[PDB]
Design a protein around this ligand. Structure first.
Ligand SMILES: NC(=O)c1ccc[n+]([C@@H]2O[C@H](COP(=O)([O-])OP(=O)(O)OC[C@H]3O[C@@H](n4cnc5c(N)ncnc54)[C@H](O)[C@@H]3O)[C@@H](O)[C@H]2O)c1
Ligand SMILES: NC(=O)c1ccc[n+]([C@@H]2O[C@H](COP(=O)([O-])OP(=O)(O)OC[C@H]3O[C@@H](n4cnc5c(N)ncnc54)[C@H](O)[C@@H]3O)[C@@H](O)[C@H]2O)c1
Ligand SMILES: NC(=O)c1ccc[n+]([C@@H]2O[C@H](COP(=O)([O-])OP(=O)(O)OC[C@H]3O[C@@H](n4cnc5c(N)ncnc54)[C@H](O)[C@@H]3O)[C@@H](O)[C@H]2O)c1
Ligand SMILES: NC(=O)c1ccc[n+]([C@@H]2O[C@H](COP(=O)([O-])OP(=O)(O)OC[C@H]3O[C@@H](n4cnc5c(N)ncnc54)[C@H](O)[C@@H]3O)[C@@H](O)[C@H]2O)c1
Lengths: 314, 314, 314, 314
């Protein structure tokens, strides 16, 4: 029964994400928004034999109509990286995009869950919060930075190394979504896994620089699109399940947090009807994992402040 | 346990198709092929938390290694339409692509199920058959023209007009995949539906021109990609289920046929372990539907002859 | 003192063509039209330090304002070929595009010179003629099928083989613009050149299939764009010089002709203030060249009929 | 006559640039390089009826053959901006592209004039210089950051305000190529123009934001391509004229400079047979202009160091 808007639906992530949402029995209305090509994408998907009604919207004059009555908004809108770039190279362009779109959300569907994919997530979530505070509708239990792909990657890499089935593996990943701020808690992995430190370190780095590995492999043709569509769909489904009374639903996500001195931080969250039911916190961790958390905090706070300062100039 | 090859994996269809395939526990190995961009696509999908081992292959030199050991090969490789073009206007270009790709298949995975998505399907399937014949490995039970999107469109459109869930609608569509050769048997629809003749004609025209509807809506940005990825994934899943011994798997598909004077024709096929188990035939049809079959045959024969003639000059 | 419109200005040919026109002191006003990207292209071109004022127009609502007061219209709007395509595969698409765009010309700038680049020229010139008839403003001295690239190619190749400066070479090319209908009158070449019949035949084939060789070299990335921009700029410059009263300006172009049983035909044309001042005809030719003319006529008639037929259907 | 290499010849700037170079009687040989599409672009251009011999090169193995014997190398290779990006946001991607390509030039055509178009120019010229130093062939009189488009824009905008022929306007533009580092010296314009202050300020700002204006207008489809092709060609032609012994050839360009405290800086340069004959300096400026120089210096030094540092960490 959920009504989901996808802002940036014509892009690399947007189209396959919209596909996965259209294919879901959980979605009864799918509104697609972009600045280009949205009508053709909507017609394409409207032919698929599922109940979700698909409507496409094009340009800022139609963004309000796209947002009317939505339960979840997902925002893959933004520019992807080229080889060599950092996520902060995209900050200027994507901060404007995220601020503009989340402003419309605050105006026209303030009650909706806001799921931000656009990078750098470590800054774009603070931006979303400060835009919502600006319109006086800020609810910290309903704004999510989608880090799900870090968890998905962690599970895959663990499963390959130990010959396990990825569907059975679960690795909490905490901190943020950029380089050393991505902290995989291999010591909390279910099932339990033992690696020597050199292999643990190699696995940790692989997970951290996984996005960059894909940017290099694509050689100028963009960043992770299909896996991020999978990761975004997964997160939305988790959130909607929880919204229909499903219990025990847990997903890591970068949110407003009091667990560390960072005002925003990613930890496992129990999800409920009002978004975040309970922040489950960092929990018990190794020395190696404590070192990474401690090392990640300055970069996190700098990014958090960079997003806040950007909204301050609006 | 099914090893699936996608030829044309970097395209508008190939990428979301490859995603849907990667997401399924029916696929144990997903080998992707194209003339550009495949390594990045493979890198992207390899991070998804499912069992399928994803490998990428690039250029004619690597095509044999993409195909070896394959159970299924799907071929979305081909040029799509621009507004104003017929599917037949693509023949010359796409003919050479299908012939070359299917020759490698006949040489390197002759036992595999061959699923051609490339247009015009009415001519490209005959090209595939003649190519396989030329190499002495022609099995008419394993060569499939993917017409599934026509069925998906029919189901959806009927479901919309009757207020039904399209997940529990099934309209057999027969003939071929081009204009008037697309024949939806609404008389055989489950559940039973009865339209007056004025509406039935419009519904029938809508289904026939659905592909062109998406072409115009995309205004030169290509044809159906996401819905075709859906339809193609469904057909492969149906085919892989049947190969795993699942019973009652029925799909319409343009295949080597003796149901009419046409050498190739689409009807509901019972699929099994060896490919086509039994052609379920045209069945009991209305006068209206009987006229369309009669009207379609000359065009289908021409399209078939065109395809056969192309291989004759190789 | 000439106001020129480019219809299809955002395309592969359109952009470099518009650039060459912008650079010319013959052009005082340049209006650019497309269905996509025009404002960005016009903004880019308007920064160049030449006198021509540039303005961009997007979509059919802005087409009339583009054409008002136009002295010359050049029409590269259309779909180019992929490898394997015949020029007739693009007929249905381009015929529609040419018909639409020439109707607006007929209504809004009926006295303007109409230079059609869009293929197949052998049919799109007939289409342009009939559309102009419907609106009661047909003038056959102002409608030009741009075949200049063929002449340009012929000059380059003859110069290459003979070690000449291509600026000092002129080869009349007659007939039409497709395959064997492209007839280089090497016997009329200035300066005089002497080839054995074997070299002459291969050279003649090279000229006829030149467009195809470029399509092959681009491997799906399109057809001749930069060389066509050059050729189209040359023809437009020739025409605008003649319109300003320059004498002895001669260009081959595909036009309304009584030189043969074909109703449209390309021969060298004396241009002047009314457009076509005098058709210079075929002249004396070799037996070899007479043979090619004879063989080409059936193709030309067919192509002329096809375009004329298409217009009746609107 | 001049042998000119274009690195990044298949791009938006590279292709039209290559066309302008091909059309010019000052070019005897045109060698084109890119990582994709080069052979198609070269085949296309090789049909144009000018004397310049055109050859296309593709991939690292063929780069040296492209550079051998070159008098001038133009390097448009690089990633363009999207809306909201600064030129500096392209640094991390384009630093490696410029470093590689200029290392190739240092090896294979060290005596050639090196014209860097790739952004950010304020940092990529220092990169170029440091790469030539590493190779022991650094000649500061032959390394040029192409700022010519800023001058072209200034000439055009001044001519539009005053109602002049832009062919007769020359505005020196100094400093660098980004935002407030672009300093148009309207007080040194020929002919002398007197502007009311409100127009002068809006003019100055227009010149500085012109690049961003075009990026905005292209709405994600790149940056200035056609006007940059015009400007880069103009610069090459001035360079070749001066190489052929023409006197009084002056062009502004971002070069090694001892005019301010910035080690690199753009001023009018008298060009001669060996590149820079003489840096003509800042000359006499107004207070308004002196202040713009003062404000620009901190940003220039920062962009310079950024470029130098990049090379020292290799
Ligand atoms: N959170 C993650 O783990 C994660 C992973 C991968 C990528 N990303 C980010 O997702 C974003 C999108 O990546 P992509 O590959 O889809 O890029 P893309 O260029 O393929 O698509 C971007 C889409 O956003 C649209 N867009 C741009 N401005 C818009 C606006 N103002 N309003 C509405 N739509 C607008 C574009 O038109 C395009 O359709 C990037 O910022 C990328 O860095 C995040
Ligand atoms: N059966 C149907 O109902 C149906 C529906 C939609 C589209 N189609 C057809 O599917 C085909 C693909 O459509 P699309 O939208 O993905 O086009 P696309 O242009 O987006 O991608 C097609 C892909 O084919 C690849 N390709 C071309 N030649 C190749 C070769 N020789 N070897 C390997 N790869 C090659 C291209 O690189 C490209 O990645 C088209 O022919 C279209 O007509 C069929
Ligand atoms: N005369 C010749 O010798 C010759 C040579 C080469 C190419 N051509 C023809 O040139 C034409 C285009 O070539 P290209 O390489 O520029 O193709 P392209 O695809 O690069 O550009 C085509 C442009 O036409 C535009 N367009 C399409 N429909 C339009 C419409 N209805 N109104 C306005 N604009 C429209 C598109 O938006 C695009 O910008 C083709 O038809 C090709 O066959 C002719
Ligand atoms: N100096 C100026 O005023 C000015 C003006 C406009 C643009 N620019 C800069 O020029 C570049 C814009 O170029 P464009 O608009 O043609 O972009 P584009 O994307 O259209 O083309 C860039 C070209 O770079 C090529 N390339 C990338 N890496 C390469 C490599 N390693 N070796 C050889 N070629 C490589 C690509 O293949 C492509 O052909 C950007 O750096 C942009 O910032 C400068």
């Amino acid at each position: 029964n959920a009504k989901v808007a996808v802002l940036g639906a014509s892009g690399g992530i947007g189209q396959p994400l919209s596909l996965l949402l259209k294919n879901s029995p959980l979605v009864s209305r799918l509104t697609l928004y972009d600045i280009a090509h949205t009508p053709g994408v909507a017609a394409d998907l409207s032919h698929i034999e599922t109940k979700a009604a698909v409507k496409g919207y094009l340009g800022p004059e139609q963004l309000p109509d796209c947002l009317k009555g939505c339960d979840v908004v997902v925002i893959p809108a933004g520019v992807p990286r080229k080889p060599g770039m950092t996520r902060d190279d995209l900050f200027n362009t994507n901060a404007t995009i995220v601020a503009t779109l989340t402003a419309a959300c605050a105006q026209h569907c303030p009650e909706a869950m806001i799921c931000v994919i656009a990078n750098p997530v470590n800054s774009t979530i603070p931006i979303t919060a400060e835009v919502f505070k600006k319109h006086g509708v800020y609810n910290p239990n309903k704004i999510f930075g989608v880090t799900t792909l870090d968890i998905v990657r962690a599970n895959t890499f663990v499963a390959e190394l130990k010959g396990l089935d990825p569907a059975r593996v679960n690795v909490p990943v905490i901190g943020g979504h950029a380089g050393k701020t991505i902290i995989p808690l291999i010591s909390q992995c279910t099932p339990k896994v033992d690696f020597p430190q050199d292999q643990l370190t190699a696995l940790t780095g692989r997970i951290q620089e996984a996005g960059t590995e894909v940017v290099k492999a694509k050689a100028g043709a963009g960043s992770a699109t299909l896996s991020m569509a999978y990761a975004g769909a997964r997160f939305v489904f988790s959130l909607v399940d929880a919204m229909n009374g499903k219990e025990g639903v847990v997903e890591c996500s970068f949110v407003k947090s009091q667990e560390t001195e960072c005002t925003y931080f990613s930890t496992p969250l129990l999800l409920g009807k009002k978004g975040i039911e309970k922040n489950l916190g960092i929990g018990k961790v190794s020395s190696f994992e404590e070192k990474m958390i401690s090392d990640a905090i300055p970069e996190l706070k700098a990014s958090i402040k960079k997003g806040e300062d950007f909204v301050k100039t609006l």
